């Protein structure tokens, strides 16, 4: 009977190890998923890095920047910088 209880002890210990393995594998799979999010960010970095500065600024910033500048001019504010910065903070949350 003692030997049978020893076998139960080791069986449950090894089932604990199987649980810990299943957790470790789930952790590793989530770790690979996270890494794939990181490699997505890597691809985005490569995409931006591809673009020489003139073109990168022109495409990404200038249309939005031009539009906001136009609206700031229509404001003729006491400070363009403050208005434009706030305007961008409001717009870009929607505007891409």
């Amino acid at each position: 009977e003692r030997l049978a209880k020893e076998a139960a002890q080791t069986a449950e210990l090894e089932h604990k190890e199987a649980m810990e393995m299943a957790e470790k594998i789930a952790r590793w799979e989530e770790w690979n998923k996270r890494l794939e999010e990181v490699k997505r960010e890597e691809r985005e970095l490569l995409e931006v890095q591809s673009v020489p500065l003139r073109n990168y600024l022109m495409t990404y910033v200038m249309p939005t920047l031009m539009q906001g500048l136009n609206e700031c001019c229509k404001v003729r504010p006491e400070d363009p910088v403050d208005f434009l910065a706030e305007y961008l903070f409001k717009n870009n949350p929607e505007m891409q």
Binding site: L46, S50, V51, N55, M58, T59, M62, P63, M66
Partner: peptide, 28 residues
């Protein structure tokens, strides 16, 4: 990592496309 010298159509650059339109009207 992948690398390109992307060819740009004038329509893609607002500045160039503006210059194009201005020149077009000037010629016309």
């Amino acid at each position: 990592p992948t690398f390109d010298k992307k060819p740009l159509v004038w329509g893609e650059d607002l500045e160039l496309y503006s210059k194009f339109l201005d020149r077009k009207e000037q010629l016309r």
